[PDB]
From a paper:
DNA gyrase is the only type II topoisomerase capable of catalyzing DNA supercoiling, in a reaction driven by ATP hydrolysis. DNA gyrase consists of two subunits, GyrA and GyrB (97 kDa and 90 kDa, respectively, in [name]), forming an A2B2 complex in the active enzyme. The N-terminal domain of GyrB is the site of ATP hydrolysis, while DNA cleavage and strand passage occur at the interface between the C-terminal domain of GyrB and the N-terminal domain of GyrA. A new GyrA NTD fragment was constructed with a view of obtaining a crystal structure of SD8 bound to GyrA in an alternative conformation that would be representative of the situation at lower ligand concentrations. This smaller 55-kDa NTD fragment of GyrA (GyrA55), comprising residues 30–522 of the 875-amino-acid wild-type sequence (compared with residues 2–522 for GyrA59), crucially lacks residues spanning Leu17 to Asp23 that have been identified as providing 10 of the 12 protein–protein hydrogen bonds responsible for stabilizing the tetramer at the dimer–dimer interface in the crystal structure of the GyrA59–SD8 complex.
Numbering used by the authors:
A (entry chain C): 33 to 175, 179 to 425, 429 to 522
B (entry chain A): 33 to 175, 179 to 426, 429 to 522
């Protein structure tokens, strides 16, 4: 599958993250065993093999795999030497903080949902992401796409620059986004390959290990130290290949080879023979090993449901258009939700102002259906809530004109009558009664504010911008990969 | 793992069935995709490989594997030829009706629960089963136990005969349970091996295919037809072994071999050469192939947490003792639950009889806490529910202190009763809803009296147990399949 251009996710990734969200497997709550999330995914969303689901989770937790990890893992999640993760019953996971930004406002009718595999559950078609995840975490797929990861600060600055100037050039965007940024650091060589990829969607660059020749001050002997290796290279396999080249005499001048890497960092030590030149040995290692690799940037993603080759500007534009859709839908949802709640609260307020006749009516009703019928049959006096209740701004858009406040009287709907019948006796106490009235007044202010936002293109675009700025403050970090 | 003697299950089976129960994957509801159950099991109860969990589900659904299937499956669940089941996202399952009897009263504090693997969930240690599942479905394990399956009517009869007479002999039990009964029918040969296994826990019997020699009336040519094969034999493997023996000339006289089995039944056809004798060919096949197999009965199960070799009476006695424990626990639970509910209903009835002062009190309380305080501070007149409430003390919860409840024509509420009043919805004031609460109270008083009779009498307890076993026999008992010779 190709990633969606808007959230950077393939279905399997989206299913995992959604399952974690539904479970409440939050960044600020206790870790859960990986098996619990796997079992949920398998059962409800991705019924295709515990090991493939668990592999997805593992990869999302590994700091050498994802530039911004989506899963916060505790335990053994494998290594850059290709060691396996521990079994899913042993490792523990929760959502990374940044994953919550990928899923912000999911409950606010911001994205379309589709059926799961058996038609018993709903799954988001795309996440309502505040993070430009496709660019920052990248994607690959060989069945094809190959998008490298990027620095979040840089990409947010590029998004804001596009919002400021929709005609910005690729050169203009590259002042903010000079190239990829790998979790594994190292060096990118080929500035024109970057530019070609950003302009056209395709370009080839080379990634090189950070390695130096050291000279021992007392003896003059040379040692090559490798500090950082290219993205997606397996360190153990790299060291084995070097040993094989030394054995076959395809690379000369190496007296010893040792991995001294540990928890604190990578350190591959290659000692140079006294009669060899360190720089020459190192150059031969770059030409014959994965100390240098090519990376064919191929920026293909799903856009309006179809596979598309996309340039840097196309990708940014799609993300920003997604934010516009999300924020507009979210604000419409909040307005609807507030109007619906205010509508119920009007009924409860009117009922509580008429508590004596309401009780009398209900007590003498043979059944709840007959009580509901009696509640809606005649309108109610407003009493001391007249001023509070008497703009049509708070009325739900679906409410017919025969209902609500009309000439000093309240005409209830059957659903309002049901809300009255559902009122608990404890709502008659002073504090509970007052809380309902206060909530109504707050909702009126919230409705007015939401209408001001929906009425103003400037307000809406500002909400989009400010959300991007906040992401940069909360999650932006330093560049790791040097571009040459 | 060894199965528990009481429910016949190993942990993995118990975790699967419990997950289905918790999901509401009931016999009378829509089928669910197998993957849904597998995912629940992996997540909460058995975090060890989707294929192993699914393999357990699948076996529990196969009519050639289980004498009484515990899972009702729809879709391809494999075959007697060893075909694999379809993938878990394309098969559908729910609990078999009889599985609900295995788990009857699980929600009634009838069995101990233990922690799952991560300490976040509880799992029953054993099922509160109304079915003697160890005997009827059997068990095997090689890491050792080997218990064949048995006919449920027969086994229930044996249980009832033990209840009637605790000193019944093995011979007495065998009048009801003459031997094993395989899902796959066929024939058992070795009556003394059965008796040895029932008396001691161990004995060897032989299982033989049902096969006949047919003669063609017009031509005289003979054909062997195999109708039924021994339990746990793979039909395809059997046919291959026969072909190999014919090829190597270790069995002579066979001109053709064909599997003509289909949906309607098994039919393996072995044509006999004109110059060979059918009966002689068939006897040679019984001596060299799985048309006949041994079955080493080895009745080992977990009893009071330890492995032990158990004879037929030991197993029956353990099942009946389990029923006594389950029914006693269930009755205690139901009594507590009914008293707790009756206690809440008294409060609601008294409040509804005092609706005007109750409303005045609440309206003038600043908060729900202060309303609760006011409700409990002083007692309430009983009004028209005096007769209903006063009438024993039989309905009082055992934990209720004497300062509470009905006292000298007045009702003294607890804080929890007051909370129940404050939680009442306005719709409960209607005539119908009010009447339903009063009717429920009166039903509870009758239920309480009946539960007290059970707890007060060992005879009444055993009568409950006996009647439950009789009902299982009536609902699920079926005909014997395997012929004993």
């Amino acid at each position: 599958a190709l990633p969606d251009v808007r959230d950077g996710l393939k279905p399997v990734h989206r299913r995992v993250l959604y399952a974690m969200n539904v479970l409440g497997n939050d960044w600020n709550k206790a870790y859960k065993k990986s098996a619990r999330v796997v079992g949920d995914v398998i059962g409800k969303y991705h019924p295709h093999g515990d090991s493939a689901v668990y592999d997805t989770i593992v990869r999302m937790a590994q700091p050498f795999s994802l530039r911004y990890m989506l899963v916060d893992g505790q335990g053994n999640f494998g290594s850059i030497d290709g060691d396996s993760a521990a079994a899913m019953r042993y490792t523990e996971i929760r959502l990374a903080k940044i994953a919550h930004e990928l899923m912000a406002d999911l409950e606010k009718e911001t994205v379309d949902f589709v059926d799961n595999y058996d038609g018993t559950e709903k799954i988001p078609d795309v996440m309502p992401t505040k993070i430009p995840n496709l660019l920052v975490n990248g994607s690959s797929g060989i069945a094809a796409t190959n998008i490298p990861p990027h620095n979040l600060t840089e990409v947010i600055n590029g998004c804001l620059a596009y919002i400021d100037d929709e005609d910005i050039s690729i050169e203009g965007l590259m002042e903010h986004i000079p190239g990829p940024d790998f979790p594994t650091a190292a060096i990118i060589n080929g500035r024109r390959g970057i530019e070609e990829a950003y302009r056209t969607g395709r370009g080839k660059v080379y990634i090189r290990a950070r390695a130096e020749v050291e000279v021992d001050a007392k003896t003059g002997r040379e040692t090559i130290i490798v500090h950082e290796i290219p993205y997606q290279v397996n360190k153990a396999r790299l060291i084995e290949k070097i040993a094989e080249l030394v054995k076959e005499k395809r690379v000369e001048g190496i007296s010893a080879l040792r991995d001294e890497s540990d928890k604190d960092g990578m350190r591959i030590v290659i000692e140079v023979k006294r009669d060899a030149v360190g720089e020459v040995v190192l150059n031969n290692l770059y030409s014959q090993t994965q100390l240098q690799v090519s990376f064919g940037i191929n920026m293909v993603a799903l856009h309006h449901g179809q596979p598309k080759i996309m340039n840097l500007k196309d990708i940014i534009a799609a993300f920003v258009r997604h934010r516009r859709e999300v924020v507009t839908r979210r604000t419409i949802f909040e307005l609807r939700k507030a109007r619906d709640r205010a509508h119920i609260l009007e009924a409860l307020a009117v009922a509580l102002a008429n508590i004596d006749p309401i009780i009398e009516l209900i007590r003498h009703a043979p059944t709840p259906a007959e009580a509901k019928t009696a509640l809606v049959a005649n309108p109610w006096q407003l009493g001391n809530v007249a001023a509070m209740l008497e703009d049509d701004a708070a009325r739900p858009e679906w409410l017919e004109p025969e209902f609500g406040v009309r000439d000093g009287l309240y005409y209830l709907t059957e659903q309002q009558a049901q809300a009255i019948l559902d009122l608990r006796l404890q709502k008659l106490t002073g504090l509970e009664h007052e809380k309902l009235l206060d909530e109504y007044k707050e909702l009126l202010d919230q409705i007015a504010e939401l209408l001001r936002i929906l009425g103003s293109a400037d307000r809406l675009m500002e909400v989009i911008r400010e959300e991007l700025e906040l992401v940069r403050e909360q999650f932006g970090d330093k560049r790791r990969t040097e571009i040459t």
